[PDB]
Design a protein around this ligand. Structure first.
Ligand SMILES: [Cl-]
Ligand SMILES: [Mg+2]
Ligand SMILES: [Mg+2]
Length: 293
């Protein structure tokens, strides 16, 4: 029995792939088991805009056209990240070879231009975008203050703590101009079963959604939270439940975006995969997708 068939009414079953998937023997297993795919590398910022104004969509287009041709859906990953993201977006070299943040006006223009050009280029070919990935520190000591809990990445240093909201606003504008496109906008993070981090993420989303909702008659700016699901055989499943119930109470949908269970035994994986799938089935009304990496 394919996972895809077992969870048909519950959630999409997904996989992360590359170009060499999609060929011959790998292609038939892909389709048999999965409804949705995410490109592992091909839609990241370094692959789509490697120098200023120079968008390179050929390889990504080829991949997405083939996935669509094959009857599967595509999840877009990722518009904004501090890894695999070219320096010119948010920094420059000063006179003495030191890399320094660009000003807020210039970096905000770059941020908005990258989000919007990418989202418009793919249009309705994706079912969802991870607009922002991994913006929160690990184990933040003060999750009551989400802005103080943000990782101080290059976007943060150029724009400040409101770059997350601005990124989602840039993406939301694209969807408002193109209401025929059915696309959910996600915020994505890992170690979501750390209760301080889940709390900081929940407070960030709630503050950003609330202010938006109050100005736009209850519409969400952030549609989804993605739990990456980089778990290990010692991952406590009650922690994953607390976090999931916490994200559900924001009225967002939830997805599991990069599920894998590594060592701290095959048996220990099975223990945890069953506890997780049990928990998902229980909350399937709120979970859109579960994707393995
Ligand atoms: Cl290319
Ligand atoms: Mg569901
Ligand atoms: Mg490309």
């Amino acid at each position: 029995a394919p996972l895809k068939d077992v969870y048909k009414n519950d959630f999409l079953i997904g996989n992360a792939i590359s170009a060499e998937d999609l060929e011959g023997t790998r292609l038939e297993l892909l389709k048999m088991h999965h409804d949705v795919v995410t490109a592992g590398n091909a839609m990241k910022p370094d692959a789509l805009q490697p120098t200023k104004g120079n968008f390179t969509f050929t390889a990504a287009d080829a991949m997405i056209d083939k996935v669509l041709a094959e009857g599967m859906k595509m999840h877009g990953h990722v518009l904004v990240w501090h890894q695999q993201s070219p320096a010119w977006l948010n920094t420059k070299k000063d006179d003495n070879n030191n890399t320094v943040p660009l000003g807020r006006d210039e970096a905000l223009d770059n941020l908005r231009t990258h989000i919007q050009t990418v989202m418009k280029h793919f249009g309705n070919k994706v079912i969802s975008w991870d607009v922002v990935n991994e913006a929160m520190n690990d184990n933040p000591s003060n999750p009551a203050d989400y802005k103080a809990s943000l990782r101080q990445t290059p976007w943060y240093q150029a724009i400040g703590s409101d770059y997350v909201e601005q990124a989602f606003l840039a993406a939301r504008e694209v969807l408002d101009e193109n209401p025929s496109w059915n696309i959910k906008l996600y915020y994505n993070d890992y170690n979501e079963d750390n209760q301080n981090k889940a709390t900081a993420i929940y407070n960030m989303v709630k503050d950003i959604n609330d202010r938006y909702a109050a100005a736009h008659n209850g519409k969400l700016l952030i549609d989804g939270v993605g739990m990456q699901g980089h778990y290990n055989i010692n991952t406590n499943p009650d922690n994953v439940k607390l976090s999931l119930e916490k994200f559900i109470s924001l009225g967002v949908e939830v997805s599991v975006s990069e599920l894998d269970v590594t060592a701290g035994l095959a048996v220990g994986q099975a223990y945890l995969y069953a506890q997780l799938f049990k928990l998902y089935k229980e909350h399937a009304d709120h979970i859109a997708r579960v994707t393995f990496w």
